[PDB]
Design a protein around this ligand. Structure first.
Ligand code: NI
Length: 341
């Protein structure tokens, strides 16, 4: 049964609410982005109108084989009427296709649901800037001040420089990169660009990536593993054993592996700088774990809520415990007192 923080009050609308079967009183189901926690339940036997972005729609048609008559793609930064109500889609600065949604309720109330997001000062010059938000449904994944990480550009900087140095020192090494889902494609697209290579990958990852409207993409990725010195692998293979095993498949082409595990936040960030990050190494194989976040840090989150000045905030991540809720409400009150709204 559908939780309260996935219902839009005063409408026939739900948000990322697909795993509960037939939601009583729902006429238009919304999907913020193509990640498994959010789409769980969708398939070729889904028969209600789904609203989403274009890219999200491609992933529904091609990866879940949801039928074409039910996918309603909506363009961004655009006022659209759905079941008598004005919606707007804005960039979530998360993974590809990821949106936030602005709902204009018939009784004058105005709701922002954030989906998943990495807050950015650029969001302060979107269509949000024109007006007031009475309720905010907020991705609170890193809502505690100990959650610090670098900017995406610092992380990619470090990944480029690392990879170009190792391969200029050893022209016979292979670079591998981890993935489970969509998102973080810059990790491997930038490493492959500094290095002269296309990216090598499986048939399933290649077709996921063919859904994402990335320009010049046919020139960047391939299913021919042998032609490539950057390779994509499932995240669970980025371990000494998984790699050893992959190094054998390549057949005396490479004699060294440098691997990148993109993680979210991890405790080591509290003490060490991006600059100072060091690998695990066994013999001829090395693994870097890198804090490439697609979620707001604490500092980013707070800044966005203070510019937005909502009347009421409802969290959507970390909702399960009394101690987590209590913690999050304490930061909402400090933010509000400080900015004075
Ligand atoms: Ni997500």
């Amino acid at each position: 049964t559908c939780p309260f923080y996935k219902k839009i009050p005063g409408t026939g609308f739900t948000v990322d609410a697909f795993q509960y079967g037939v939601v009583e009183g729902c006429t238009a189901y919304f999907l913020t982005h193509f990640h498994s926690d959010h789409y769980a339940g969708l398939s070729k036997h889904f028969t209600f109108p789904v609203y989403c972005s274009e890219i999200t729609g491609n992933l529904l048609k091609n990866k879940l084989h949801v039928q074409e008559q039910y996918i309603h793609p909506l363009p961004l930064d655009t006022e659209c009427i759905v079941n008598g109500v004005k919606v707007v889609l804005l960039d979530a600065n998360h993974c590809p296709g990821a949106v936030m949604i602005l709902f204009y309720l018939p009784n004058g109330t105005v709701i922002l649901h954030t989906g998943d997001f990495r807050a950015d000062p650029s969001m302060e010059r979107s269509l949000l800037a024109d007006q007031k938000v009475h309720m905010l449904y907020l991705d609170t994944t890193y809502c505690s001040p100990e959650y610090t990480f670098p900017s995406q550009q610092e992380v990619i900087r470090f990944a480029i420089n690392t990879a170009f140095e190792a391969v200029t020192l050893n022209p016979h090494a292979l670079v591998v990169c981890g993935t489970y889902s969509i998102g973080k494609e810059k990790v491997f697209l930038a490493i492959a660009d500094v290095l002269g290579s296309k990216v090598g990958m499986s048939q399933e990852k290649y077709k996921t990536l063919q859904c994402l409207n990335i320009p010049e993409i046919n020139s960047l990725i391939t299913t021919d593993m042998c032609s490539s010195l950057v390779h994509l692998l499932p995240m669970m293979q980025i371990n000494f054993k998984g790699l050893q095993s992959h190094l054998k498949k390549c057949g005396g082409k490479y004699n060294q592996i440098l691997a990148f595990r993109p993680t979210g936040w991890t405790h080591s960030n509290k003490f060490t700088r991006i600059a100072d990050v060091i690998p695990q190494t066994k013999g001829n194989i090395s693994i870097y774990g890198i804090p490439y976040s697609e979620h707001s840090s604490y500092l980013e989150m707070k800044r966005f809520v203070q510019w937005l000045k909502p009347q009421k905030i409802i969290p959507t991540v970390n909702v399960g415990t009394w101690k987590s809720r209590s913690t999050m409400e304490k930061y909402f009150r400090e933010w509000k007192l400080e900015a004075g709204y």
